[PDB]
DNA sequence: AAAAAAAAAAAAAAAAAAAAAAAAAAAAAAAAAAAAAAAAAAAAAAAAAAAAAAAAAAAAAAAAAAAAAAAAAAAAAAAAAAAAAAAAAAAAAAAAAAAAAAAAAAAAAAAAAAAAAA
């Protein structure tokens, strides 16, 4: 479950992940987040 | 686009380490008595020096313990086999100076934003 928020006054979005898969850890969900950023893997990533 | 290797799921096998608390011993590093050793003073037994002397090597010569010869017999030591102790030769090594790659601070300047003036 991932939708796209929007804010009302700036035009910024966030990306809210309310569930994850079955069998997966948050934390390495969130330390390969942290990589991809890292490495320049994914483009776009603001905070987390 | 093919090959290869990591990692993660869950039942199995098998291990490792840090501290507290008291009382005794064992290493290991220091002050501090205590005695060799060394520098620099005065001080005092020994060599010198000389005259004077008498005790032991020479010399005669007998004789009595001796060192070579003979014999028998016992068996220490030497050289050849093995089997251990203990030391130079040579090579290796762990920290350790040198080099190279990544994290944090820096401001110049502008995009976007927030806020307010007339």
Same mark, same amino acid.
């Given at each position: 479950?991932?939708?796209?928020?929007?804010?009302? &006054?700036?035009?910024?979005?966030?990306?809210?992940?309310?569930?994850?898969?079955?069998?997966?850890?948050?934390?390495?969900?969130?330390? &390969?987040?942290?990589?991809?950023? &890292?490495?320049?893997?994914?483009?776009?990533?603001?905070?987390?």
């Amino acid at each position: 479950r991932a939708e796209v928020e929007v804010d009302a &006054k700036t035009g910024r979005e966030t990306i809210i992940v309310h569930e994850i898969p079955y069998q997966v850890n948050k934390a390495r969900l969130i330390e &390969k987040i942290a990589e991809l950023v &890292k490495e320049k893997r994914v483009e776009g990533i603001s905070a987390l």
